[PDB]
Amino acid sequence: HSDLTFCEIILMEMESHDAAWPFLEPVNPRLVSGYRRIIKNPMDFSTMRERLLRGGYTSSEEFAADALLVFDNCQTFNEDDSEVGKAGHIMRRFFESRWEEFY
Numbered sequence: 001h002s003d004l005t006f007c008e009i010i011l012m013e014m015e016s017h018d019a020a021w022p023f024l025e026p027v028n029p030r031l032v033s034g035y036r037r038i039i040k041n042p043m044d045f046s047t048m049r050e051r052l053l054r055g056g057y058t059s060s061e062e063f064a065a066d067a068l069l070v071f072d073n074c075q076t077f078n079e080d081d082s083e084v085g086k087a088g089h090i091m092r093r094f095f096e097s098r099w100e101e102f103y
């Protein structure tokens, strides 16, 4: 039980982070040219939240795979010095940081 509890804590702290604005909702491919073609498996914090409330995470590690997917997609699509990229680096470092001081 404590596994998914810590997932709730981490996901809530990510949802409310100052750098979280790019990842709160699915990327709108109609508005981001090329995103559909470049990113095979989109992921975002609201999709993770919907899946977590609905109970659809078996382990803490599937959760961590979805978070890492958020940041891998970010680095794949955005230059490291773009605004979304800078936000994504702050969020990724925050996630690995929080994740490790649990497990």
Ligand SMILES: Cc1cc2c(cc1S(=O)(=O)NCc1ccc(F)cc1)n(C)c(=O)n2C
Residues within 6 Å of the ligand: 021, 022, 023, 027, 028, 031, 032, 073, 074, 077, 078, 084
């Ligand atoms: C919020 C956001 C998150 C992103 C993103 C772009 C944006 S956004 O700020 O540009 N929103 C789309 C948009 C809005 C108005 C426009 F006129 C044009 C585009 N990318 C390229 C990503 O990988 N993530 C996660």
